[PDB]
């Protein structure tokens, strides 16, 4: 019975991986977003779906990479924030807790500020109990947004000049002036005596894949 649900869930994750492994410029923001919405509406990933015949149960680990496949929110509508909160809601039912690794890359996926707030708010609606990981990952994401802004500014003014200013240089050295959770004092961003900065930079698909493949190799050998 539910064995059927799991089978159709196998085809599901097959095509999720199919579009995840693409990760090409041929997949544009608009295209990725509407392709994701297409998958969700194909396989009935709404919370309205009953407990049995819930397709999201049998997606191992394809759930998180489907989840952060949503994240940069295209420019059409504010509809986008809903895809996300559908997925999370299902997790809420199913019992699978969100890994901090997953939400860290989730914030690392964010393009603008309003989107970062969009995410945090969304997992507020989704009954996620906020931890220090939540807060610090968010702050990190804001910080890298500003760092990215300034990086854009200085490369920009380097382009119309041809040699860097001293502002460009000491920006390169000490980073953002008066940052929250800064580099020069690393002991601040730490939670449970482990440093928390994943979200301070962008990640490709192959980065994510690199980490878990590393894990897999370590199992297959050691």
């Amino acid at each position: 019975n539910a064995y059927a649900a799991m089978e159709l869930a196998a085809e599901a994750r097959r095509e999720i991986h199919e579009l995840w492994l693409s990760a090409e410029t041929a997949l544009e923001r608009e295209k990725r977003v509407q392709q994701v919405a297409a998958l969700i509406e194909k396989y009935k990933l709404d919370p309205s779906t009953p407990r049995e015949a819930d397709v999201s149960r049998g997606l191992g680990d394809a759930f998180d990479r489907l989840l952060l496949l949503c994240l940069p929110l295209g420019k059409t509508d504010a509809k986008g924030t809903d895809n996300l909160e559908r997925l999370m809601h299902l997790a809420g039912r199913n019992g699978r807790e969100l890994s901090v690794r997953t939400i860290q890359h989730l914030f690392a996926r964010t393009d603008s500020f309003a989107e970062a707030l969009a995410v945090f708010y969304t997992m507020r609606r989704c009954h996620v109990a906020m931890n220090m990981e939540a807060y610090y990952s968010m702050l990190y994401s804001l910080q890298r947004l500003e760092e990215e802004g300034w990086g854009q500014h200085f490369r920009n003014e380097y382009e119309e000049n041809g040699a860097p200013s001293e502002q460009a240089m000491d920006f390169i050295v000490k980073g953002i002036s008066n940052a929250l959770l800064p580099e020069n004092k690393p002991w601040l961003g730490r939670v449970m005596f482990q440093d928390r900065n994943v979200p301070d930079r962008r990640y490709d698909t192959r980065d994510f894949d690199e980490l878990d493949t590393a894990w897999t190799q370590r199992y297959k050998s050691g």
């Binding site: 109990a129 906020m130 005596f193």
Partner: protein, 49 residues
């Protein structure tokens, strides 16, 4: 009753900095190797060197 909340407690939230005040402690934080000295015999001895 008055304080009962959906947010889990301090331990889940890991609000606290520091930790044990002595840093890494074989009994409390880190693992413990070797032998227990229950009497203080090794704990006060005089360096012969």
């Amino acid at each position: 009753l008055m304080a009962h909340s959906d947010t889990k407690g301090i331990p889940y939230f890991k609000v606290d900095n520091r930790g044990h005040s002595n840093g890494r402690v074989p009994g409390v934080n880190a693992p413990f190797f070797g032998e227990f000295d229950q009497k203080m015999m090794q704990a006060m001895s005089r360096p012969l060197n």
